[PDB]
Amino acid sequence: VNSFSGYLKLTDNVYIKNADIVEEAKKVKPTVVVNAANVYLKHGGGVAGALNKATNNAMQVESDDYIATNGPLKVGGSCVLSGHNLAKHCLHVVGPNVNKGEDIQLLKSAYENFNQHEVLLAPLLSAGIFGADPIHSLRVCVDTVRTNVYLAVFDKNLYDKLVSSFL
Ligand SMILES: OCC[C@H](CO)Nc1ncnc2[nH]ccc12
Ligand SMILES: [Cl-]
Numbered sequence: 001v002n003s004f005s006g007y008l009k010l011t012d013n014v015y016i017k018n019a020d021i022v023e024e025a026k027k028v029k030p031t032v033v034v035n036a037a038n039v040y041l042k043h044g045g046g047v048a049g050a051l052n053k054a055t056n057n058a059m060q061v062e063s064d065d066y067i068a069t070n071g072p073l074k075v076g077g078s079c080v081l082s083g084h085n086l087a088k089h090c091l092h093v094v095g096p097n098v099n100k101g102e103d104i105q106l107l108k109s110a111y112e113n114f115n116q117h118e119v120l121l122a123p124l125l126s127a128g129i130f131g132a133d134p135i136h137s138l139r140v141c142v143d144t145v146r147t148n149v150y151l152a153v154f155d156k157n158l159y160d161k162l163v164s165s166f167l
Contacts, residue, residue, distance in 0.1 A: 002119060003028050004150045010166055013148045014141060018159035021047060021123050021152040022054045025086040030150075033083055034114070034122035035059075036130065037092035039072040046129040055084040063092070075102050076109030091117060098131030107137065111144040119148045128154075138162050 007015035017024075025033045036047040041063035043052035052059040062081055073079060078093040095110040096102035110125050124141065126132035134153075141149065153159040 002148075004030075004121075007150055008163060010138075011142055013146060014151065015149070016138075016151045016153065016159070016162065018154075018156045019152040020050075020154055021121065022050050022086070024121055024150075024152045025051075025083075026054070028121060029087060030083075030119065030121040031088045032091050032117045032120045033087035033089075034120055034125075035090050035092045036123050036125060036128070037073065037078075037094050038097065039075060039077075039094055041067055041073070041092060047123045051086065051090070054086060058082075058084050059090065076106040078110075078113035087121070091120065093125060095126035095130055095137075096132070097129075098126065099129070104132060104136075107132065107140050108144050111141055114141075114145045114149055115147055117147055119150075121150050121152060123152060123154075134158055134162060135165055138166065 007017045009015055035051055043049055043060050073094050075094050075096055081090050083090045093110050093113050096104050096106040107126050114120055124134050124137040127134040127137050
């Protein structure tokens with residue numbers, strides 16, 4: 001039993017809800033919140049910009065030190081950093097950004113990072129400003145993640161389409 005509330009069960013382990021991931025994280029304080037990161041951990045907009053703003057820019061400061069030490073992530077890769085005031089940990093995961101010409105096949109590799117954590121709050125990878133089809137991202141999530149994932153979808157119209165079209 002966990003404290004996630006109001007989710008629709010899609011499979012044994014994947015759940016979905018219309019919600020602002022920032023407001024969800026603040027309420028639940030999950031062990032892990034997933035950020036929709038880029039390789040430079042520059043959290044300027046989308047999920048990343050919103051999560052960082054909610055930390056009063058502490059996420060960005062921590063991320064800049066991470067990059068200075070380790071260099072950029074790989075597309076499809078991840079790193080674990082602090083969750084600040086939102087969660088215990090933040091798993092920064094880089095899905096492919098179609099608007100940069102990045103290979104969508106790397107979306108499965110990105111979701112594989114979730115399997116290293118027993119329970120996660122997350123957005124759909126490569127959706128939004130990363131330009132991929134959110135229906136496809138949900139399919140890859142369901143077919144790749146085996147741990148318990150609670151997906152927050154910000155747009156109510158998109159949420160209803162993902163549910164009504166889900167196979
Ligand atoms: O699930 C990823 C794609 C959705 C499309 O609505 N974007 C978001 N979902 C949840 N929380 C969010 N906060 C800021 C953006 C955002
Ligand atoms: Cl977005």
